[PDB]
Amino acid sequence: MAYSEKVIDHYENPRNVGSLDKKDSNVGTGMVGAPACGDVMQLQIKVDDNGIIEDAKFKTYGCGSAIASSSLITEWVKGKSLEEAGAIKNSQIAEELELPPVKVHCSILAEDAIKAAIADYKAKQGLEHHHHHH
Ligand SMILES: [Zn+2]
C-alpha cells in the first residue's frame, strides 16, 4: 500500500480460522460425530448481513458420500435467513440427495448441526431466565 513498496515481507497471509473472535453474538458453532461411519462433521454459520448468514463454512471427511452433503447444505444455507436454515430438517436434504435409509446417519448429522449452531448462537443472546432446577 502507499507508494513505499519495500516493506511487507510475508505476503498478506490469513491468521484466523472460520470464526471472527469466538465471541459468539453472531457465530453458531456445531461439531457432531457419527460413530457409524467414524466421520466428524464440523459446521460453522456466520450471521451479520442483518441477522442473515453472511457466510457459512463446513469441514467433514470419512464417509463415502457425506463429503458431498456438505457442499449442498453449504450452497443452500449461504446468505439465507436462519428461519430457512433451521427448518430444512434432515428428511429434506436426504430427499435432495436420494440415498439409502441405513445411510441417512450422515444426513441426520447435517441437520443436527444447523440446530446445534443456532442453539449455541442463541445461548449468548440473553434469553436465559432463572436457571431451571430440580
Ligand atoms: Zn456416514
UniProtKB/Swiss-Prot annotation:
Cofactor requirements of the protein: Zn(2+)
The organism's place on the tree of life at top rank: Bacteria
Pfam families reported for this sequence: NifU_N
CDD domains reported for this sequence: IscU_like
GO biological process per UniProt: intracellular iron ion homeostasis; iron-sulfur cluster assembly
Note describing how the cofactor binds: Binds 1 Zn(2+) ion; this is probably a substitute for Fe-S centers.
Ligand binding (Zn(2+)): C37, C63, H105, C106
GO cellular component: cytoplasm
Transmembrane segments: none
SUPFAM superfamilies reported in the protein's UniProt record: SufE/NifU (SSF82649)
Keywords noted in UniProt: Metal-binding, Zinc
GO molecular function: 2 iron, 2 sulfur cluster binding; ferrous iron binding
NCBIfam families with a match to the protein in the record: iscU (TIGR01999)
Family: Belongs to the NifU family.
Subunit structure: Forms a heterotetramer with IscS; each subunit of the IscS dimer contacts an IscU monomer. Upon overexpression can be isolated a monomer, dimers and other oligomers.
UniProt function note: A scaffold on which IscS assembles Fe-S clusters. Subsequently gives the nascent cluster to other proteins. It is likely that Fe-S cluster coordination is flexible as the role of this complex is to build and then hand off Fe-S clusters.
Protein name from the UniProt record: Iron-sulfur cluster assembly scaffold protein IscU
